[PDB]
Each structure stands twice: as C-alpha cells, then as structure tokens.
mmCIF file of C-alpha atoms in Angstrom:
data_model
loop_
_atom_site.group_PDB
_atom_site.id
_atom_site.type_symbol
_atom_site.label_atom_id
_atom_site.label_comp_id
_atom_site.label_asym_id
_atom_site.label_seq_id
_atom_site.Cartn_x
_atom_site.Cartn_y
_atom_site.Cartn_z
ATOM 1 C CA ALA A 21 103.253 111.589 126.440
ATOM 2 C CA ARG A 22 102.990 109.294 123.423
ATOM 3 C CA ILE A 23 102.301 109.458 119.754
ATOM 4 C CA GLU A 24 99.566 108.480 117.810
ATOM 5 C CA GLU A 25 100.724 109.103 113.869
ATOM 6 C CA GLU A 26 103.179 111.630 112.092
ATOM 7 C CA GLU A 27 103.856 112.818 108.635
ATOM 8 C CA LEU A 28 108.048 112.885 107.989
ATOM 9 C CA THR A 29 110.126 113.875 105.541
ATOM 10 C CA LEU A 30 113.312 111.674 105.610
ATOM 11 C CA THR A 31 116.008 112.344 103.369
ATOM 12 C CA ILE A 32 118.086 109.057 102.306
ATOM 13 C CA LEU A 33 121.482 109.334 100.735
ATOM 14 C CA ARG A 34 123.196 106.023 99.360
ATOM 15 C CA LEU A 39 118.367 101.712 99.916
ATOM 16 C CA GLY A 40 117.843 98.392 101.948
ATOM 17 C CA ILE A 41 114.385 98.842 101.941
ATOM 18 C CA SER A 42 111.411 96.509 100.352
ATOM 19 C CA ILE A 43 108.678 98.296 99.266
ATOM 20 C CA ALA A 44 105.497 96.499 98.810
ATOM 21 C CA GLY A 45 101.775 96.666 97.968
ATOM 22 C CA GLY A 46 100.360 99.221 95.689
ATOM 23 C CA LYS A 47 97.177 99.919 93.884
ATOM 24 C CA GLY A 48 96.768 96.378 92.060
ATOM 25 C CA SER A 49 98.431 94.225 94.527
ATOM 26 C CA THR A 50 97.480 92.561 97.467
ATOM 27 C CA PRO A 51 98.301 95.520 100.327
ATOM 28 C CA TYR A 52 100.772 95.211 102.949
ATOM 29 C CA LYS A 53 98.335 96.222 105.799
ATOM 30 C CA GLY A 54 94.617 95.021 105.902
ATOM 31 C CA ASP A 55 92.456 97.427 103.981
ATOM 32 C CA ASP A 56 95.748 99.890 102.667
ATOM 33 C CA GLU A 57 96.402 99.299 99.244
ATOM 34 C CA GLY A 58 98.979 101.998 99.790
ATOM 35 C CA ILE A 59 103.485 101.374 99.195
ATOM 36 C CA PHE A 60 104.937 100.545 102.335
ATOM 37 C CA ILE A 61 108.292 100.193 103.687
ATOM 38 C CA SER A 62 108.273 95.968 104.581
ATOM 39 C CA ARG A 63 111.741 95.210 105.167
ATOM 40 C CA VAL A 64 114.707 97.632 105.975
ATOM 41 C CA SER A 65 118.204 96.053 106.210
ATOM 42 C CA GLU A 66 119.792 97.152 109.530
ATOM 43 C CA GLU A 67 122.724 98.269 108.086
ATOM 44 C CA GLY A 68 121.684 100.072 105.179
ATOM 45 C CA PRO A 69 121.542 103.302 104.081
ATOM 46 C CA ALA A 70 117.888 103.730 104.746
ATOM 47 C CA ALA A 71 118.360 102.652 108.419
ATOM 48 C CA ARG A 72 120.662 105.589 108.995
ATOM 49 C CA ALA A 73 117.899 108.159 107.841
ATOM 50 C CA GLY A 74 115.539 106.984 110.159
ATOM 51 C CA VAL A 75 113.149 105.275 107.728
ATOM 52 C CA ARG A 76 111.537 102.352 109.963
ATOM 53 C CA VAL A 77 109.364 99.278 108.911
ATOM 54 C CA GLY A 78 105.519 99.763 107.973
ATOM 55 C CA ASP A 79 106.009 103.782 106.862
ATOM 56 C CA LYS A 80 103.719 104.606 103.864
ATOM 57 C CA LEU A 81 105.306 106.135 100.720
ATOM 58 C CA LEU A 82 103.655 108.906 100.149
ATOM 59 C CA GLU A 83 105.607 110.984 98.447
ATOM 60 C CA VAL A 84 109.273 109.998 97.080
ATOM 61 C CA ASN A 85 111.867 113.074 95.621
ATOM 62 C CA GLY A 86 109.112 115.575 94.891
ATOM 63 C CA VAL A 87 106.770 112.895 93.230
ATOM 64 C CA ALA A 88 103.475 111.712 94.736
ATOM 65 C CA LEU A 89 103.266 107.959 95.295
ATOM 66 C CA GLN A 90 99.921 108.557 97.617
ATOM 67 C CA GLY A 91 97.417 105.916 95.710
ATOM 68 C CA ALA A 92 99.515 105.320 93.477
ATOM 69 C CA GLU A 93 100.468 101.849 91.149
ATOM 70 C CA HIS A 94 103.601 99.617 92.589
ATOM 71 C CA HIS A 95 106.011 100.234 89.539
ATOM 72 C CA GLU A 96 105.289 103.758 89.973
ATOM 73 C CA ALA A 97 106.814 103.085 93.965
ATOM 74 C CA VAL A 98 109.775 101.263 92.734
ATOM 75 C CA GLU A 99 110.659 103.539 89.405
ATOM 76 C CA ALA A 100 110.591 106.246 91.746
ATOM 77 C CA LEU A 101 113.418 104.550 94.169
ATOM 78 C CA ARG A 102 115.216 102.932 91.379
ATOM 79 C CA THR A 106 122.945 108.283 94.387
ATOM 80 C CA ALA A 107 120.358 110.418 96.866
ATOM 81 C CA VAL A 108 116.774 110.170 97.304
ATOM 82 C CA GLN A 109 114.289 111.862 99.430
ATOM 83 C CA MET A 110 111.563 110.538 100.829
ATOM 84 C CA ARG A 111 108.477 111.909 102.930
ATOM 85 C CA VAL A 112 106.478 108.883 104.416
ATOM 86 C CA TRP A 113 103.519 108.750 106.881
ATOM 87 C CA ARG A 114 103.362 107.093 110.519
ATOM 88 C CA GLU A 115 100.483 104.469 112.618
ATOM 89 C CA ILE B 4 104.581 91.662 96.568
ATOM 90 C CA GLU B 5 107.655 92.479 98.008
ATOM 91 C CA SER B 6 110.010 94.435 95.641
ATOM 92 C CA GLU B 7 114.084 95.362 96.143
ATOM 93 C CA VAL B 8 115.126 98.700 96.267
#
C-alpha cells in the first residue's frame, strides 16, 4: 500500500541531471555524503528513463560509486549509461 | 556542489 524505499536499475540512453555531494563535499542530504541527483531537466534523457531528484547514485556502468569522491561520480557519468540508484 | 552532467 506504500513504498518506504527501493533500489532501481535504470538505464538511460543519450544526460540532463546534476549530481551533488560526494565524500569531501558538503552533503546534499543532512548526513549523507553520497552522490545524489539534485536537478533533473524535465525534457532530458534521464527524466524519461525514470531518474528522479533525490535518488542516491550507487553504481554507474558497473563501477561502484557507493561512498566515492565527487569527481569519481562525475567521471563515471561524463552515448549510453546505466545507473543503479537507491530511493527514499 | 551541483555539477552538470
């Protein structure tokens, strides 16, 4: 009757997102230094593929970004990109 | 830090 939290395996195809956080930078959420999806353009590819603001980037194209630095999360995301994220 | 991607 509701969803408290879930993990998705969303594959985008070009990204129209803006990742925030990462170990060593002021966290997006109150106490989570992990990489987050902060802004998602309504039109872009990420929007259509199911990515939503507030998702927690866990793994990108087989590389694990669980507890990784900011430029590690960016380097992993800068044609086709599959990301695995945690929600609520 | 909001980085564009």
